[PDB]
Amino acid sequence: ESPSLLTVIIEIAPKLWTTFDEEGNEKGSIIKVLEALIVFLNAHLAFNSANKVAVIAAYSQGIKYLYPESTSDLKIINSDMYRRFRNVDETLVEEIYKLFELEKKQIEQNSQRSTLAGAMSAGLTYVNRISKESSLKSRLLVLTCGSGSSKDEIFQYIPIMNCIFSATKMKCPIDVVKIGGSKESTFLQQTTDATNGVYLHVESTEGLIQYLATAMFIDPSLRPIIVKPNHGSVDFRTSCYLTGRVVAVGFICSVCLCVLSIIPPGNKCPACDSQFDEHVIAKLKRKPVVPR
Amino acid sequence: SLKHSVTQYLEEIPQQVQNRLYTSPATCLAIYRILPPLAKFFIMAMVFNENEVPLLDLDKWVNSNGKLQFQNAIKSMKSLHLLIPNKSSGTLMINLNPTFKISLRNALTGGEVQNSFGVVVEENVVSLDLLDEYSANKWETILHFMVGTPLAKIPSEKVLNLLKHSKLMEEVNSTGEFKITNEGFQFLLQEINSQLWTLLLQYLKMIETMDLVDVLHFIFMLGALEVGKAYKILSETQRIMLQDMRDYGLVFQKHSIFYPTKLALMLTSDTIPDGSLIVETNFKIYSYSNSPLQIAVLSLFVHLKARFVNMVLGQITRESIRRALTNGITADQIIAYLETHAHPQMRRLAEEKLEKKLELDPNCKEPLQVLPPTVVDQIRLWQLELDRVITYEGSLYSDFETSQEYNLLSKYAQDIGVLLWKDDKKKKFFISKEGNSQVLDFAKR
Amino acid sequence: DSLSKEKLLTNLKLQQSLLKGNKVLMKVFQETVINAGLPPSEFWSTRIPLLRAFALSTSQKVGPYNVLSTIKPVNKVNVNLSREKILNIFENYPIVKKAYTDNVPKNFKEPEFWARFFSSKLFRKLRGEKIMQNDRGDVIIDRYLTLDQEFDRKDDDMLLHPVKKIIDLDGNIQDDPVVRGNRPDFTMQPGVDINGNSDGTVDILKGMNRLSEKMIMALKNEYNDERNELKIDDLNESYKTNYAIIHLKRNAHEKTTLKVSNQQMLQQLSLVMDNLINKLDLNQVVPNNEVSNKINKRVITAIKINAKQAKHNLEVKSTLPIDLLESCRMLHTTCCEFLKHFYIHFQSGEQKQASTVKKLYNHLKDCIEKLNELFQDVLNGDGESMSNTCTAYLKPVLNSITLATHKYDEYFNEYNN
Amino acid sequence: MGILDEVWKHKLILVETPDAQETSLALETYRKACSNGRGAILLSVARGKVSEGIDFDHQYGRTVLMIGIPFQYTESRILKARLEFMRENYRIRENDFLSFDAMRHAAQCLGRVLRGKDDYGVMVLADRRFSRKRSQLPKWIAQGLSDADLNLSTDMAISNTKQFLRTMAQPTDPKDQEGVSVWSYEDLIKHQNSRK
Amino acid sequence: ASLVASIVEARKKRTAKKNITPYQRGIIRSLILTLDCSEAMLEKDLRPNRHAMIIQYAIDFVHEFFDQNPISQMGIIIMRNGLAQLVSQVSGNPQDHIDALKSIRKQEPKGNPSLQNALEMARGLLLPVPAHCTREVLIVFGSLSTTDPGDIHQTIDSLVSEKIRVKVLGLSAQVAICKELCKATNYGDESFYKILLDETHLKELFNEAVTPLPVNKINKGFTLVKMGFPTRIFEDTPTFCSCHSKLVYGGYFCPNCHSKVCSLPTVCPCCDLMLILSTHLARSYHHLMPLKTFAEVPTTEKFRSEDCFSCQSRFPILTSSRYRCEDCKQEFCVDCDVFIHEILHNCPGCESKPV
Ligand SMILES: [Zn+2]
Ligand SMILES: [Zn+2]
Ligand SMILES: [Zn+2]
Ligand SMILES: [Zn+2]
Ligand SMILES: [Zn+2]
């Protein structure tokens, strides 16, 4: 039908990749992933002649517009392959080596924040840019190494929600590929379910070629005539603000609107300092009255 | 019907000849480009595992909403002999063509290509200045030759013979002149890759043993080729028709190094606007387009006035209309050009009028013509007033009896495609002279 | 007024009115109280906003307007009377209402009356038409002329009121009671006819002024300050919003219900940069077709599972007998109504609610037994051919109902036991 | 003609009664009608009792239909004797003095619209002969009287009035008038120093 | 010379948006749009007529209001022929009011308005409304007058006493009584009686009315509210729903009383408790966390970068179009500034910059 603007974000982080390859033994698994993605973009740009690809990597200190080159020469790959495929693959391996050399250079400083949401947002802006230029399908791909330490998704939660709402406005499914020890990533699973995206988690770096060639090929040209393969289901619930556990039925502030599994101490808001009404909370604490 | 015509031709190509075509990765890449999305997905899934599948697994995977499209994809898949579906263990065991499979695999991996993507010399030069200019020159010469406006640079004698034999732009030997057939105007209406594909289909049809699969593989890799580089001059049949398509201006060859122009790229794939025309009830032309080719083709069916930078003006006359009509050029062809040359403001006004008339009545009691009938139906009324009769000439069988027999004989002619007209109420029908003998034999039996 | 919960429950006539308005409300109410015998106050206790909305919809009335000015004279004339406008004329002109009520129920017909009315000069007088002795009017309607005149006098007497001195033109002209000048112009004074009498334009102008005054006093119905009046707001301070901003302190609890080292990650990083600059092969990515076959098995299993999920993608089409379908829908509906009312009683939390809770518990038990007996009926009507589907269709409301019963029993054992 | 019946459908109509008391009740009615916003129209003589001490503002002073030149009654021997005496005394042109008095009565009629600078209003001149009298007219009045406005018809009068209403229906930034129209104490100080 | 006019227009525009505040703004909303369908809106004076455009704009308003703020109920009462007619009760489903408005499409606007009756029955409809819900009414009006049965000032006093605000979008010009309503209801503010100048301005006004409004400190109602996240099931068997009493394949399940529903964000029909998703509550967090404006750096000074930080394009070169996020110290293009300030609700420069 139409050229599908391909959007691929690769979450590269040595804190995750070192953790994964030390947990297992597949050194160069990230290289295997990169080669698989090279074949994936080849299969995509051979599926359609103009389904243009946006490739962005988010490193530890920030993000990088990988494909294409900025608005401001060895060949590792073979010379017998296709021209456009070779140009893209050579450009990406050059950009990847430059980013990895940079990452080796500035390895020793510490930044504990994931940049996945910012990378996703910048990619969505570029999707707006491409779609506003000249009619193009929007499909967003994330590659993550989930074997790293799940430190704090709490600050990541809000912009991820904002990105979900934006992609909902933009009819862009958010398809998730996870490689890690943890089977489940709740926010990503919720993201896939809300955006009609595809969630998938495995561990072995082998067979990802067949995995994301078979499953991760759904385009908006043929989305309604393809069943989604996701098996997990999400309650769309959140952990409590002061006890950190998910709540089924509970309480939220009339002002801050944060989930309270229990009564806040001092009857004041733990988010926006609103003192509440004692008769209200006593009625909330009321037991039912039962006949003797 | 370009993919339909090529797929039909390859289905006409036998199974092992198809398998010979499926040997090389460049041919497999071009054919994969031809395949529809469902079959494309199927083969890219199965190409990386040597696990044959039964049809039941694919059927369970397939959502039934697009099951007709799935049927089309697998019908093409089987009829191209790209599949080997056998009822193994009672189940229709699905198997891709293995030569196609491995050649696609090597093309995707960048593995063994045997320079099917091209025997490369890689002496790149500028193409906009030599290749594009010579290409535009030669294509301009053949295009104005095909227009009929006078031009000195005649085409090759091979293509001249192909035009003489073919029903495209008839070089009528009684007149000694190339003459616009209705098929010639179809070619004029065609897209550029459509014109190239019609030309190569006709040349492949006329050419015989010159190895047909050599021409096929060479055509597929020539489509697969890239612009602006020198390459090694391969099969000799491929080389001599390569020199032929050099004389067509497709490649810029320095008699061994050859430099393929942009025409190979357009043959491979496609790449208040230009070509947008404002219609007028006064038949005035407000074209947002200009070329000497545009004037040359507008000379056939439009009375023009002058040439300016984008502003080509004129007035469509009924003399111009009937000049188009008397060439055998179809009014449907004319409105094909017209409806491919519409303008934004007028089509927005037409859609506003359509949405206004939608709420009043579904039929609107108006003729079905979306382009504004104030100007557009004036041609369409002239289109209906052009033909406006039905002529039947030759044999005719009359005064049938039993209606039975009349329906039987008439139905039989329709089945064999020799029936030209019938009337239940008079129990009469007309059949072509070719089918006369067949109908008579059936009547006796 | 008619706005309390007691008033809305009291208005049985209005309750019957929107009852008769709906049809599923006869169905529901009939099952609720005619069939199940629920307290109809508690029936209407849920539908209180609906009752008040119906009341307020029925309760509004229009504002006054110049109905005689909207009357047009329209050869011949055909009466095209509108009853709402006839009552508008009645309300605007009680004299015309009186002239209707003492003549039509006594002497002649309504359309004959209105033809006489349009013929009458009293109609012209009450409208913006100057009376003329050339017009004959209608004698029966024009007998009310002096009655309308003394109505006008009484109404003007009513309309008289004292005036503020801040705007009192009478005080303004009573500034100097001994002004001795010259007689003002005939042009700019109220002109008269030849014989000194007026034409009556002052009468028609004071009449339309009386119409305006009657308007504004109809507005002014049952349903010092000059300091505020003379304020010059243009030289005053601009109003500023007292809207409160909000901050947000941020301290979230961690999610509740081995550690890597820089040396080791640096060693691996050095090694993988070495591998990166060393080599990269696309061709090695092809799997072993056996672990890949297990991947095929996993993928196809996921496809089968989610396809069976998608296989069950007006209500659904069903092969029920239509009567039993309606009966089971009805039973589901009244069970839902019972359950909602029982929850209303339970979440209320009073000792006054106790007998209500007990009785609704009994009703829920009765509904359970009736569901079971219905299951016996579809049992011996189907041989459990699709009586299984009947049981499963009525299942989840039954599960919620019996869960509520268990909750009631548990809280009974909590408090009493 | 029954035009007043059409006028009934939009606003009330109030006429200057010869009784000042009924006129007072009438103006109270107009006041309350513009108070509730249902709208009303006053009909008063140019020299009539309303015109000499009653102001109208921000809904009361919004638009005025001045009807023609308010010339005095021409055939007054009293007026003619006045004209003769004042011409004999101060060499006064009689027609010019008549235009002066008409003039000044019209200004008295039209001066009761703008109470504060926040108010706004539109003025009409419903006579052909007014066009020669802008030089007569008061300076601040005529400074808003543009040269295109000297001879207008109903259509562009309506269009300009609608656009004026659209214009006056907008808020205004205080920065554009904080030093040129409205003055603070510091603004007056700065102006006084600038005078110094 | 058009760029100088554009620059001074942008300056006079940005003078209003210089002050950006984190006011407490209402989330539990209660919005009523009454419609008049009278003889005034029969004017074709704006194309095609006022009735058609207010229908279309109300469709858009319903969509935008339910998208941005799904945590409110919407009621519509039409005004026609001296009567105010309720056509849409307050509900969580926008589609009901969409269908009611589609019924309003084909019927004919005629009559005269009565804001007294309209606001009175709007008050009565707004009467059984909980405390946290912010009762506010949008009123469209085309007349310059209002026929009424009785006093409006008693209604004004009652509405002020019952803590309901109004905002009037008049058509022709200002009406003094509507100004009085807006001022007295709105604590003396004049920022609520708004008059359009064209249909584009009407569109902008409707978009402005979409947004939540700030609340007052004196109008203090700071409390908690009980909430419950339900669970969605995907069952093989169709099942009867509690709300519409019909067979449903799927449906959420009640967290408290374990019944099932058909739509969200809705309250329970059985345990009678509100059920939402965390997406719904996080939907207004841009209102809860506003975004600072981005400053163009001047063309005279030296520049940190010459191409856009976010969209990655070259900055064009008289003036300098480098909108700087001072919170992240990065300059951006106008397109990215628009997208981040309106569509997005995060600054990726501040996402990359660690705190
Ligand atoms: Zn809070
Ligand atoms: Zn339902
Ligand atoms: Zn519940
Ligand atoms: Zn940018
Ligand atoms: Zn920033």
From Swiss-Prot, chain A:
One short Pfam name that applies is: Tfb4
Q: What is its main location?
A: nucleus
Q: Enumerate the subcellular locations listed in this protein's record, separating them with semicolons.
A: Nucleus
Supply the InterPro entries for this chain.
TFIIH_Tfb4/GTF2H3, vWFA_dom_sf
Q: Does the keyword Coiled coil apply?
A: no
Please indicate if the UniProt record lists tRNA-binding as a keyword: no
Enumerate the transmembrane spans.
none
Start-end of C4-type zinc fingers: 253-272
Alphabetized Gene3D superfamilies for the sequence: von Willebrand factor, type A domain
GO cellular component labels: nucleotide-excision repair factor 3 complex; transcription factor TFIIH core complex; transcription factor TFIIH holo complex
The protein's UniProt keywords, in alphabetical order, are: Acetylation, DNA damage, DNA repair, Metal-binding, Nucleus, Transcription, Transcription regulation, Zinc, Zinc-finger
The Gene Ontology terms for molecular function here are: zinc ion binding
GO biological process, alphabetically ordered: nucleotide-excision repair; regulation of DNA-templated transcription; transcription by RNA polymerase II; transcription initiation at RNA polymerase II promoter
* PANTHER family per UniProt: GENERAL TRANSCRIPTION FACTOR IIH SUBUNIT 3, TRANSCRIPTION INITIATION FACTOR IIH TFIIH , POLYPEPTIDE 3-RELATED
Q: What do we know about how this protein assembles, alone or with others?
A: Component of the 7-subunit TFIIH core complex composed of XPB/SSL2, XPD/RAD3, SSL1, TFB1, TFB2, TFB4 and TFB5, which is active in NER. The core complex associates with the 3-subunit CTD-kinase module TFIIK composed of CCL1, KIN28 and TFB3 to form the 10-subunit holoenzyme (holo-TFIIH) active in transcription. An additionnal subunit, TFB6, plays a role in the dissociation of the SSL2 helicase from TFIIH after transcription initiation.
Q: Which family does it belong to?
A: Belongs to the TFB4 family.
This one is known as General transcription and DNA repair factor IIH subunit TFB4
Swiss-Prot record, chain C:
Superkingdom of origin = Eukaryota
Q: Which GO terms describe its cellular component?
A: cytosol; nucleotide-excision repair factor 3 complex; nucleus; transcription factor TFIIH core complex; transcription factor TFIIH holo complex
Keywords for this entry? DNA damage, DNA repair, Nucleus, Phosphoprotein, Repeat, Transcription, Transcription regulation
Q: Output one GO BP term.
A: nucleotide-excision repair
Subcellular location per UniProt equals: Nucleus
Keyword Acyltransferase appears in the UniProt entry: no
| The family this protein is said to belong to | Belongs to the TFB1 family.
Its function?
A: Component of the general transcription and DNA repair factor IIH (TFIIH) core complex, which is involved in general and transcription-coupled nucleotide excision repair (NER) of damaged DNA and, when complexed to TFIIK, in RNA transcription by RNA polymerase II. In NER, TFIIH acts by opening DNA around the lesion to allow the excision of the damaged oligonucleotide and its replacement by a new DNA fragment. In transcription, TFIIH has an essential role in transcription initiation.
Question: Extra info from the record?
Answer: Present with 5150 molecules/cell in log phase SD medium.
What is this protein's name?
Answer: General transcription and DNA repair factor IIH subunit TFB1
Organism per entry: Saccharomyces cerevisiae (strain ATCC 204508 / S288c)
Q: Give the classification, highest ranks.
A: Eukaryota, Fungi, Dikarya, Ascomycota, Saccharomycotina
Q: Which gene encodes it?
A: TFB1
Q: Which residues of the full protein are shown?
A: 167 to 639 of 642
Curated annotation (Swiss-Prot), chain D:
Q: Where in the cell is it found?
A: Nucleus
Q: What happens when the gene is disrupted?
A: Essential, it cannot be deleted.
Q: Which domain of life is it from?
A: Eukaryota
Q: Which family does it belong to?
A: Belongs to the helicase family. RAD3/XPD subfamily.
Subunit description: Component of the 7-subunit TFIIH core complex composed of XPB/SSL2, XPD/RAD3, SSL1, TFB1, TFB2, TFB4 and TFB5, which is active in NER. The core complex associates with the 3-subunit CTD-kinase module TFIIK composed of CCL1, KIN28 and TFB3 to form the 10-subunit holoenzyme (holo-TFIIH) active in transcription. An additionnal subunit, TFB6, plays a role in the dissociation of the SSL2 helicase from TFIIH after transcription initiation.
Q: What else is known?
A: Present with 14400 molecules/cell in log phase SD medium.
Q: What does this protein do?
A: ATP-dependent 5'-3' DNA helicase. Component of the general transcription and DNA repair factor IIH (TFIIH) core complex, which is involved in general and transcription-coupled nucleotide excision repair (NER) of damaged DNA and, when complexed to TFIIK, in RNA transcription by RNA polymerase II. In NER, TFIIH acts by opening DNA around the lesion to allow the excision of the damaged oligonucleotide and its replacement by a new DNA fragment. The ATP-dependent helicase activity of XPD/RAD3 is required for DNA opening. In transcription, TFIIH has an essential role in transcription initiation.
- Lineage per the UniProt record: Eukaryota, Fungi, Dikarya, Ascomycota, Saccharomycotina
Q: Which gene encodes it?
A: RAD3
Swiss-Prot record, chain E:
Protein name (database record): General transcription and DNA repair factor IIH subunit SSL1
Residues of the VWFA domain: 30-209
The species this protein was found in: Saccharomyces cerevisiae (strain ATCC 204508 / S288c)
Q: Which residues of the whole protein does the chain here span?
A: 96 to 459 of 461
**Anything else known:** Present with 2340 molecules/cell in log phase SD medium.
Q: What does the sequence similarity comment in the record state about its family?
A: Belongs to the GTF2H2 family.
According to the record's subunit comment, the protein's assembly and interactions are: Component of the 7-subunit TFIIH core complex composed of XPB/SSL2, XPD/RAD3, SSL1, TFB1, TFB2, TFB4 and TFB5, which is active in NER. The core complex associates with the 3-subunit CTD-kinase module TFIIK composed of CCL1, KIN28 and TFB3 to form the 10-subunit holoenzyme (holo-TFIIH) active in transcription. An additionnal subunit, TFB6, plays a role in the dissociation of the SSL2 helicase from TFIIH after transcription initiation.
Question: Does Protein transport show up as a keyword for this record?
Answer: no
Principal localisation: nucleus
Report the stretches of sequence that form zinc fingers (C4-type).
254-271
Question: Care to name a GO molecular-function term for this sequence?
Answer: zinc ion binding
